[PDB]
Ligand SMILES: NS(=O)(=O)c1ccc(NS(=O)(=O)CCNC(=O)Nc2ccc(F)cc2)cc1
């Protein structure tokens with residue numbers, strides 16, 4: 001099916017998922033001179049103290065760490081959000097070179113990678129129902145630039161060689177996602193979509209202003225992963241990012257002036 005290649009990449013997705021040309025697709029370029037400070041936005045509440053990570057998985061388009069969302073353990077609230085959203089998983093998008101890899105861009109600037117912490121609105125009962133609602137998910141997006149190592153990322157980096165190929169998974173319990181956050185929770189927000197198929201328009205995007213720094217050795221280990229499954233031709237998992245989509249009738253708001 002779909003992927004990031006010449007013949008199955010983002011320019012092809014609309015044939016199976018016509019919402020790819022919809023009115024609130026993600027990612028988008030964040031024009032910092034057009035985003036408006038919104039004083040009515042409240043601070044984000046990231047309550048990850050009780051997070052219970054479960055497994056880490058190569059799904060053939062990225063790697064993800066999953067969490068127990070059967071109860072309010074790791075939740076996102078506040079900011080633009082109404083009610084409570086449970087953390088389900090996080091994954092990344094990254095490039096073949098340090099000058100590309102993020103999905104969102106800031107004044108057309110591309111970061112080396114982008115972290116997505118995926119949360120779903122508990123009023124819809126389960127994530128499958130939430131995906132069918134315009135306010136069903138909230139994804140917290142964090143940019144990665146190459147510089148100093150990120151100590152809270154190293155334990156993810158350490159296990160990637162055990163999930164090199166599509167379909168492999170590993171135990172990944174007792175991981176603390178707070179170690180992936182920057183200092184500031186200043187953010188931009190806009191209504192958008194999943195950035196991979198089915199591209200459902202169900203996401204409140206919350207993109208942090210402050211990137212985290214990761215070392216060249218850490219991002220190099222992202223780039224050793226494979227899109228392919230074991231025993232089939234090796235295609236390095238790089239450049240698994242969708243480019244910026246038309247903003248159309250949308251306003252990006254900033255929590256900071
Ligand atoms: N790149 S991004 O925008 O951050 C992003 C974030 C998440 C996704 N995909 S997801 O699978 O996790 C969507 C939510 N999970 C489910 O819906 N599962 C499900 C359960 C029961 C059903 F009956 C049907 C489906 C894609 C892109």
Ligand SMILES: [Zn+2]
Nearest residue numbers: 091093116195
């Ligand atoms: Zn993503």
